[PDB]
Design a protein around this ligand. Structure first.
Ligand SMILES: CCCCCCCCCCCCCCCCCC(=O)OC[C@H](COP(=O)([O-])OCC(O)COP(=O)([O-])OC[C@@H](COC(=O)CCCCCCCCCCCCCCCCC)OC(=O)CCCCCCCCCCCCCCCCC)OC(=O)CCCCCCCCCCCCCCCCC
Ligand SMILES: CCCCCCCCCCCCCCCCCC(=O)OC[C@H](COP(=O)(O)OCCN)OC(=O)CCCCCCCCCCCCCCCCC
Ligand SMILES: NC(=O)C1=CN([C@@H]2O[C@H](COP(=O)(O)OP(=O)(O)OC[C@H]3O[C@@H](n4cnc5c(N)ncnc54)[C@H](OP(=O)(O)O)[C@@H]3O)[C@@H](O)[C@H]2O)C=CC1
Ligand code: SF4
Ligand code: SF4
Ligand code: SF4
Ligand SMILES: [Zn+2]
Lengths: 239, 123, 350, 117, 140, 123, 233, 136, 181, 114
């Protein structure tokens, strides 16, 4: 009954398997019924707000709604306050830069409903001069997210009470997450003894950045995939 | 709730260039009035008139911009900069980025003609 | 982009036949191709000179005595730019090691007092002689030797006399050297100048505070030195670097008082009494006002009629009155509408 | 020994530190800088330094040249550089070397030379 | 006395600070050597830069370093502080804290282990133990 | 064409003294895959003084050109031109070259020759 | 995230290793957070006691990954290497005493009237405001809302293990402290279940187009060498 | 064990000269059996006293007064960190490295004239023309 | 109650022996508590660098993935069988409302169906006329539920919570922290 | 811990300059130069690691097809100057020679698991 005679676990007989059996299954399959449900749900939403919902997309368990910027406040209000949706938590807001589009920036909102245990995504668009309506009036938590989106991308949010840089240095010029902003920026700092202060100077690198993306594959890697649309959401063929 | 900070202005894109002109001249007045506060916060060597001159030069740079959206963005960013300077959020190091001329002569050789630029491989 | 503001051109030939090609735009990662040794680089003027040199990527060799005292210099350059050597004036090999690879050698070694190991002659004549001999033996392209204003051989001052002697011995040994004589230098944390006036208990003059000189900003002396370093048309010339407008010591004390908002205490004493005091105080181990500085207090600055000046370097010295507030800021001492405005505010709460 | 610098002054370097490796005097690649060139171009950072402490790895080309040729019966030698004492995969990828042509033939990976017999 | 009363101010920027915390934890117990971490630079002899130094932070670090009374030393700890590390090519990162302050010892690792940091402290103590102070004055 | 130059925060030298090239990647001569040839690349022409030089300590390649490694991808030549105009960038379009089509027949390797063979095909 | 985009499946042993080391990581995090919180209020001793436990767990980190902190151990596909031979036994022996380690911290804090003076009704958040502000984890569970992704949307092996979720009611610092202390215990529970149910097999997905093949294949088989070359370049 | 009896017992087991040596280097009083010696002269010990905690059963006594962890030879460095059960002198011949070069151990020379001087192992990528005149 | 107290001699920590064990048992707040010092002969022994199992370890694999004779790679190539993202704009949903679906058609054969598909694909019917035209059967089956209710925001795996009270709870009755399972 | 370049038992270098370590390096800490050796071998003429850029992730050691670049268990190599932390090929080869026995213990213990 002492630690001196505690049994040696190191010499207990271990389990020994001969062959491990792991069947081959496509991970997407488990989503199929849920995918159908999301389709049905999205149809309802688009039928209820046809003034606003430009479209929707469904990938395995993620539902996205696509709307114009002027649609953001009503649809968001709906998503927050309708009894079947009840998306009370704002998860994140960010932007994605698409330089080929006439509207560079797509603004992405993710929402969570703890009531229904459900997530949803909402997209709109913007440019370097056309703002988006701030949703701080609906979610206080949105505040900082919009600030980050302004700091990284330059998207403005109309109605934001206090919109300023949150990440970058004071007086930083540029929006670093744009595809045309260079990786190491334009300016670097050092301590200047003549001036007795930290000074900013044009960037100079002892070793230049080496960009190895020139070695990307010359062959298309994955192909088209397969479509998981339910049969109730495909147009019929005549006969 | 999450309340705004000192000298915060909610973002509003003016629908008209005259309604923006009013706001812009008000921002210019704010900068000129804060110049002495700036000279005290940032312990600058130069004079208050130098600060006000610099402010005028900044506002002058965009004197001929036409598109309303661009002027709206220039105004909103200028107000952000005012809020940053007046709240002492900036340190001296970033504030002095605005005054490159105030530093002393960087050297004997700043080329102006083709030959001088060519001798320094800058032609 | 940065620039090489110190260089006139990109390809350079030293007088010793070395080809130097400048690489880069001129910033921290750029290199000029030059190598310089700065004797006395850890001191007041040397640190500015080293900062300016290392800024554009010229290789700087710094001979030092005490390790901890030179550490700040390392910050002024990129990796491999500032290089430290242990050096002592009684070790000839160490001087040779210090100058061996350089295109430029500048000597800023001087002391305003005597020590148990170095009197004025040992530090200003013998040390200058040894550095110059190393320079001449290794055939260095450029040698800049710094002396003081009023350097004269038969001077009443031992400082001035040994500085004139050092000039003569330098010219005798290396005939292509450039001699530079700065006026008194003020600046951030200067020696026996503004900083002393802003925190002394009492300034004590044996000549009523009547001596005149043309005080010069240390930054300007370093900038002039960099220009002399890189243009080979200053070979074998003498430079008198002095400020624009002449001042009396009492005037400078008055400006210091007015900018300080505090009255500086001045006492006038007899030269014999004050010289005795300074001789007595030389017994402690930390630097203290010299008997020879009291001697120099009776000498006013005398500019050589025929010597190159800031003008020949295309340089314009700044003004002490405009600089003093910036230079002395840490030592500064520090209604009807206010009352009415105060009435509207809350001063006590729950 | 005596290396003339760009200054025109002399750098003295002991003979043994001019050798590219302790087991080899000369360079083994056209792009390889010789010790003499290294000192000529970097002497400032070598002043007041002890050369005997600097890394001086042995040149592998002489060492591999010292290994005897392995003779093989057929047309093809197989090499993997394996460690028969340790577990796991400790050699190089297993390759096959043709030995039909006259002379010895080197493993691309480890330099071991094979020959038909 | 300098070795035995080794009081660092922590610039605990990032993950490196975690390893610094483990130096004071019971396994290594830094205070057994006389090391005490001080909030105030006024009461500190050593600055340990432990974490990524951003451009926004550089003047703050310089300011804290300047308020240290002399004598003073700096230890750079970790790749970020040493030369920028994983973030060397970032627009917002200082590429080594020796662009801002003089550095006496560099400790490698991402992060350096607690033992690596202790080894660096021992190197700084070796440098301290070999300093000439009155002998240096005697040379003058 | 909106002058977004003045709202981005980029240096003025980018829209003043730099030239960009807009092109499609050529089919590599070493491979038969064409997967990288459809996008429209935008990248900057090099600057002589600032491009690359050898570091004197370890031998790394230094650079002063902050755009040297940046390459934008566009889904069309027109999108790329629009973006370049919106940033005030002077550009050059390199039109792509494509393989001219011809008819290839295996049987052509065995066509009967009525006169002297011009060459012996070997297979 | 990358596995979802790749449409691949982590093998079962890999999922169990990820769950076990996720709960070890949760213990490490809560040691840091609770002891740092106590140190800020002025209770200096729980920090030392908890950092010794952190040292013990960081040894497991180092033995599976070769690093104390930045393991780079969990990767898209599974984990980078299999567990070494004597690890499950050592984790079990650490687990047999961690409960006492938790009891002594609770002896110092849970009923201390000064601790309560610093934590009770401090930093109160209502449930509705918690949802509106984007709070999650304890910051949410303290306000009375039973939400936890491990139970609501189960990932790697959390569906295969038994544990409870603590929920507060006052939405203050003291409720959140109690939640974190209970989460310590639940993580110990899960770690024991993983030590008992660790299955055999691969630890990364068995497709060499996604994860690198084992080295003895890489140095013997041509396809394996090609796939290794391509994955690393 | 923090007890006084442990210290007294170890000092008796170890002898007064060893007691003073340990008190002047490591500051504790350890008693254990010698396992082996370094190429540098450091000595390594293992103790099996039940009063010694986990990770304290192996230790080194350094050969020189300015001791440094970098003076521990590789192999012994792994053993001292409980990397391997068996000590380098006890490792069979099959598990030793074959060398075709002489083995030399060197510690950290930082802060010393022997500190590593880095350099570029390549000559410059572009070679200049050696100028030669010709007569017209 | 599993998880309950276990005695100190079943914990892998050093502890005390002899008279000192009696003293510790008399003086402990909780006698079953361990000290936290691992047992030196048992813990992390043998060292990870001298494990015998290292010399028998083989790369693990599972059947049928490791079969040499019946697994083409393309039958288990799950990356290339990835689900496509389905995009629906309002024209497509208009078509779903009017023409019905592949699952349940409401389209005529021949040229009629292709022309109907074309004229919805061109803009002839808008989404709102589509919705107004839609019958009760369509609206209830295919927009709302068969009862007329809207569908709820769907959940992949529904979680039924239960509250554990009494002795199996983590804290006793007083504490403001409950146990949810 | 600190990096080293290993040899074959013959004394020939193991590194054949495939540059897989340089490609994988998340910190771009490796710089490599190669050409044909005068005996015809594919070998590096320059192998540099910036230890102040390196994040000590071990990816180079995983990537290497011939076990050439390795991380030792050594952590005690702090320096007084940053220039001492730019490792060239000579330094790394000397590290391999210095630490080969400890490297062999580590390999004998972990090679089956890689
Ligand atoms: C122990 C005894 C006291 C030790 C004091 C040592 C000392 O004086 O250090 C000075 C030293 C001078 O400071 P400094 O930075 O050089 O500032 C001076 C100026 O920068 C520029 O300096 P300066 O040129 O103005 O010179 C000021 C001068 C003061 O000189 C004068 O003002 C006298 C002028 C009259 C000269 C003629 C008099 C008649 C002589 C008769 C002939 C003999 O002080 C000195 O020269 C050095 C002290 C003399 C020591 C020499 C000993 C040699 C023999 C050994 O003090 C410091 O280092 C500062 C330390 C911080 C002090 C903090 C606490 C201060 C408040 C304490 C209040 C205590 C109240 C208690 C009730
Ligand atoms: C406990 C030990 C206390 C005794 C320490 C022993 C000190 C040894 C000093 C050797 C004496 C050599 C000497 O002549 O020193 C004189 C020195 C001034 O020498 P110097 O460097 O030339 O200063 C010029 C600046 N005015 O002036 C001094 O040395 C002043 C030092 C006085 C120390 C008195 C301590 C009793
Ligand atoms: N400041 C002024 O107003 C004037 C200065 N000058 C001259 O300018 C030059 C530098 O000026 P400044 O910076 O103000 O003076 P500092 O005292 O600040 O620096 C002088 C330098 O010379 C070194 N020095 C003094 N004696 C010796 C010695 N025996 N051996 C080695 N080095 C020695 C010092 O090294 P260490 O730190 O180790 O002691 C120090 O680095 C001097 O030659 C001075 O005479 C002349 C006209 C005006
Ligand atoms: S060096 Fe590594 S561990 Fe240290 S702060 Fe930087 S990223 Fe974090
Ligand atoms: S350990 Fe990681 S960061 Fe360091 S050299 Fe290797 S791959 Fe690069
Ligand atoms: S160290 Fe290995 S991976 Fe790197 S270049 Fe050499 S052989 Fe290739
Ligand atoms: Zn081979």
């Amino acid at each position: 009954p002492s630690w001196e005679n505690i049994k040696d676990i190191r010499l207990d007989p271990k389990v020994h398997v001969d062959e491990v059996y792991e069947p081959i299954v496509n991970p997407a399959d488990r989503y199929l019924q849920h995918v159908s449900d999301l389709h049905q749900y999205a149809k309802y939403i688009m039928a209820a707000l046809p003034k606003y919902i430009q479209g929707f997309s469904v990938w395995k368990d993620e539902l996205t709604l696509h709307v114009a910027p002027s649609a953001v406040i009503p649809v968001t209000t709906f998503l927050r306050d309708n009894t079947s949706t009840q998306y009370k938590s704002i998860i994140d807001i960010t932007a994605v830069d698409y330089p080929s589009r006439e509207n560079r920036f797509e603004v992405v909102y993710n929402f969570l409903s703890v009531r229904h245990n459900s997530r949803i995504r909402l997209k709109t668009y913007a440019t370097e001069v056309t703002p988006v309506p701030s949703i701080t009036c609906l979610y206080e938590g949105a505040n900082w997210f919009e600030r980050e989106a302004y700091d990284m991308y330059g998207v403005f949010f109309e109605g934001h009470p206090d919109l300023r840089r949150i990440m970058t240095d004071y007086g930083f010029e540029g929006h670093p997450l744009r595809k045309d902003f260079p990786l190491t920026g334009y300016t670097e700092v050092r301590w200047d003894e003549e001036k007795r202060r930290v000074v900013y100077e044009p960037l100079e690198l002892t070793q230049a950045f080496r960009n190895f993306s020139a070695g990307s594959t010359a062959w298309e890697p994955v192909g088209p995939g397969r479509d998981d649309r339910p049969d109730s959401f495909k147009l019929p063929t005549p006969k | 709730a999450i309340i705004a900070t000192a000298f915060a202005e909610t973002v509003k894109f003016s629908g008209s260039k005259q309604e923006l002109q009013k706001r812009t001249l008000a921002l210019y007045r704010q900068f000129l009035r804060g110049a002495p506060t700036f000279a005290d916060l940032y312990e600058v060597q130069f004079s208050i008139p130098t600060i006000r001159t610099k402010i005028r030069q900044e506002f002058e740079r965009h004197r001929f911009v036409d598109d309303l959206s661009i002027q709206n963005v220039l105004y909103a960013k200028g107000h952000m900069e005012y809020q940053e300077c007046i709240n002492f959020w900036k340190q001296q190091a970033q504030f002095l980025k605005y005054f490159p001329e105030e530093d002393d002569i960087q050297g004997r050789h700043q080329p102006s003609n083709f030959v001088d630029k060519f001798l320094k491989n800058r032609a | 982009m940065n620039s090489f503001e110190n260089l006139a051109q990109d390809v350079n030939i030293t007088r010793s036949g070395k080809t130097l090609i400048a690489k880069g735009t001129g910033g921290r990662s750029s290199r000029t191709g030059y190598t310089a040794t700065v004797f006395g680089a850890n001191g007041f003027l040397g640190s500015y000179l080293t900062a300016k040199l290392a800024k554009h990527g010229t290789t700087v060799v710094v001979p030092y005595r005490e390790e901890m005292a030179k550490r700040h210099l390392k910050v002024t350059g990129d990796l491999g730019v500032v290089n430290f050597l242990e050096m002592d004036l009684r070790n000839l090999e160490s001087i040779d090691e210090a100058v061996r690879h350089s295109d430029i050698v500048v000597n800023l070694i001087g002391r305003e007092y005597e020590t148990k190991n170095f009197n004025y002659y040992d530090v200003h004549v013998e040390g200058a002689r040894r550095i110059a001999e190393a320079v001449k033996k290794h055939n260095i392209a450029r040698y800049i030797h710094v002396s003081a204003f009023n350097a004269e051989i038969d001077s009443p001052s031992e400082f001035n006399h040994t500085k004139g002697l050092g000039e003569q011995v330098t010219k005798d040994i290396v005939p292509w050297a450039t001699i530079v004589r700065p006026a008194p230098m003020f600046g951030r944390e200067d020696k026996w100048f503004l900083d002393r006036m802003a925190r002394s208990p009492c300034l004590v003059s044996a000549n009523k505070f009547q001596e005149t000189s043309n005080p010069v900003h240390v930054i300007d002396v370093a900038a002039a030195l960099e220009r002399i370093c890189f243009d080979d048309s200053t070979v074998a010339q003498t430079f008198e670097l002095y400020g624009p407008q002449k001042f009396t010591q009492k005037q400078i004390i008055d400006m210091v008082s007015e900018t300080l908002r505090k009255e500086v205490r001045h006492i006038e004493l007899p030269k014999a009494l004050y010289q005795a005091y300074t001789k007595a105080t030389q017994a402690i181990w930390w630097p203290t006002y010299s008997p020879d500085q009291v001697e120099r207090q009776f000498l006013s600055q005398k500019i050589d009629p025929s010597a190159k000046t800031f003008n020949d370097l295309d340089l314009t010295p700044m003004e002490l009155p405009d600089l003093m507030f910036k230079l002395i800021r840490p030592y500064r001492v520090n209604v009807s509408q206010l009352e009415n405005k105060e009435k509207t505010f809350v001063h006590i709460l729950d | 020994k005596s290396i003339i610098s760009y200054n025109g002054n002399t750098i003295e370097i002991p003979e043994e530190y001019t050798k590219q490796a302790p087991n080899r005097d000369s360079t083994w690649a056209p792009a390889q800088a010789s010790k003499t060139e290294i000192y000529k171009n970097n002497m400032v950072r070598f002043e007041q330094k002890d050369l005997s402490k600097q890394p001086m790895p042995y040149a592998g080309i002489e060492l591999i040249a010292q290994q005897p040729v392995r003779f093989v019966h057929g047309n093809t030698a197989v090499c993997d550089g394996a460690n028969h004492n340790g577990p796991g995969a400790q050699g190089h990828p297993k390759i096959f070397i043709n030995v039909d042509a006259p002379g010895s033939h080197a493993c691309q990976y480890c330099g071991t030379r094979y020959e038909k017999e | 006395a300098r070795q035995g009363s080794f009081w660092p101010v922590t610039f605990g920027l990032a993950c490196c600070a975690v390893e610094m915390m483990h130096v004071s934890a019971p396994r290594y117990d830094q205070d057994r050597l006389g090391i005490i971490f001080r909030a105030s630079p006024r009461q500190s002899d050593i600055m340990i830069v432990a974490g990524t130094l951003t451009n926004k932070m550089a003047p703050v670090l310089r300011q804290v370093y300047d308020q240290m009374p002399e004598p003073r030393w700096v230890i750079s700890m970790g790749s970020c502080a040493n030369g920028g590390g994983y973030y060397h090519f970032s627009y917002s990162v200082v590429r080594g804290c020796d662009r801002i302050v003089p550095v006496d010892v560099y400790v490698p690792g991402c992060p350096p282990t607690s033992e690596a940091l202790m080894y660096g402290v021992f190197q700084l103590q070796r440098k301290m133990r070999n300093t000439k102070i009155t002998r240096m004055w005697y040379r003058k | 064409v909106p002058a977004h130059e003045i709202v981005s925060g980029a240096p003025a030298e980018l829209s003043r003294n730099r030239v960009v090239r807009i092109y499609q990647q050529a089919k590599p001569a070493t491979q038969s895959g064409e997967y990288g040839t459809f996008a429209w690349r935008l990248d900057w022409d090099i600057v002589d003084v600032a491009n690359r030089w050898e570091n004197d300590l370890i031998g790394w390649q230094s650079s002063g050109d902050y755009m040297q490694a940046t390459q934008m991808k566009f889904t069309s030549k027109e999108s790329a031109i629009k973006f370049a105009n919106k940033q005030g960038w002077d550009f050059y379009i390199q039109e792509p070259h494509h393989r001219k089509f011809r008819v290839k027949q295996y049987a052509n390797n065995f066509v009967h020759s009525y006169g002297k063979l011009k060459h012996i095909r070997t297979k | 995230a990358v596995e979802k985009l790749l449409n691949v499946e982590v093998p079962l042993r890999g999922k169990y290793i990820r769950t076990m080391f996720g709960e070890i990581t949760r213990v490490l995090n809560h040691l840091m957070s609770v002891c740092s919180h106590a140190m800020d209020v002025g209770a200096l001793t729980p920090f030392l006691w908890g950092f010794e436990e952190r040292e013990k767990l960081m040894e497991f980190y180092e033995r599976v990954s070769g690093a104390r902190l930045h393991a780079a151990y969990v990767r898209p596909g599974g984990v980078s290497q299999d567990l070494p031979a004597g690890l499950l036994d050592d984790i079990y022996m650490w687990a047999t005493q961690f409960g006492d380690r938790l009891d002594e911290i609770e002896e110092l804090l849970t009923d201390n009237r000064i601790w309560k003076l610093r934590t009770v009704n401090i930093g109160t958040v209502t449930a509705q405001d918690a949802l509106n502000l984007g709070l999650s984890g304890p910051m949410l569970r303290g306000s009375g809302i039973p939400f936890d992704i491990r139970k609501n949307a189960p990932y790697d092996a959390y569906d295969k293990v038994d544990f409870d979720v603590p929920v507060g009611m006052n939405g203050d610092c003291y409720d959140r402290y109690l939640i974190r202390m209970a989460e310590f215990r639940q993580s110990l529970r899960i770690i024991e279940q993983c030590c008992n149910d660790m299955p055999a097999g691969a630890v990364k997905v068995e497709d060499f187009k996604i994860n690198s093949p084992p080295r003895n294949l890489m140095k013997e088989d041509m396809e394996a060498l090609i796939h290794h070359f391509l994955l690393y370049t | 064990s923090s007890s006084l009896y442990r210290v007294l017992r170890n000092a008796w087991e170890v002898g007064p000269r060893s007691y003073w040596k340990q008190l002047n280097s490591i500051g504790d009083t350890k008693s254990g059996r010698l396992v082996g010696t370094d190429i540098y002269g450091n000595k390594f010990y293992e103790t099996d006293h039940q009063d010694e905690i986990h990770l304290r059963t192996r230790y080194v006594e350094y050969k020189e007064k300015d001791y440094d962890m970098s003076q521990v030879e590789p192999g012994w460095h792994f053993w001292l960190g409980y990397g391997v059960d068996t000590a380098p002198c006890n490792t069979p011949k099959e598990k030793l490295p074959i060398r075709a070069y002489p083995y030399k151990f060197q510690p950290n020379y930082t802060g010393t004239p022997g500190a590593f001087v880095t350099y570029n192992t390549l000559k410059p990528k572009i070679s200049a023309w050696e100028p030669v005149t010709k007569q017209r | 109650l599993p998880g309950g107290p276990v005695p100190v001699f079943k914990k892998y920590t050093v502890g005390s022996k002899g008279i000192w064990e009696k003293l510790r048992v008399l003086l402990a707040i909780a006698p079953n508590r361990s000290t936290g010092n691992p047992i030196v002969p048992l813990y992390r022994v043998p060292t990870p660098g001298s494990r015998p199992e290292a010399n028998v370890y083989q790369d693990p694999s599972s059947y049928p993935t490791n079969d040499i004779a019946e697994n083409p790679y393309w039958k288990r190539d799950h990356r290339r069988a990835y689900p496509q993202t389905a995009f629906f704009d309002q024209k497509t949903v208009t078509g779903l409302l009017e023409l019905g679906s592949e699952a349940t058609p409401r389209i005529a054969d021949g040229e009629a169906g292709t022309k109907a598909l074309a004229n919805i694909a061109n803009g002839g019917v808008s989404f709102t006329q589509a919705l107004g035209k839609s019958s009760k059967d369509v609206i209830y089956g295919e927009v709302l539920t068969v009862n007329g209710l809207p569908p709820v925001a769907p959940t992949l795996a529904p979680k039924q919570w239960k509250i554990i009270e009494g002795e199996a709870a983590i804290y006793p009755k007083g504490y403001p922290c409950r146990t949810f399972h | 811990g600190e990096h080293a370049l290993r040899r074959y038992p013959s004394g020939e270098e193991r590194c054949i300059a495939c540059k897989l370590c340089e490609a994988i390096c998340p910190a771009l800490a490796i710089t490599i130069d190669a050409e044909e050796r005068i005996d015809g071998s594919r070998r590096t003429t320059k192998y540099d690691i910036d230890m102040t850029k390196c994040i000590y992730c071990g990816y180079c050691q995983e990537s290497c097809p011939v076990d050439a670049i390795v991380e030792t268990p050594n952590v005690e190599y702090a320096t007084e100057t940053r220039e001492e932390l730019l490792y060239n090929k000579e330094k790394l080869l000397a590290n391999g020679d210095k630490w080969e026995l400890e490297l062999q213990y580590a390999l004998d213990a972990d090679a089956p698991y890689r």
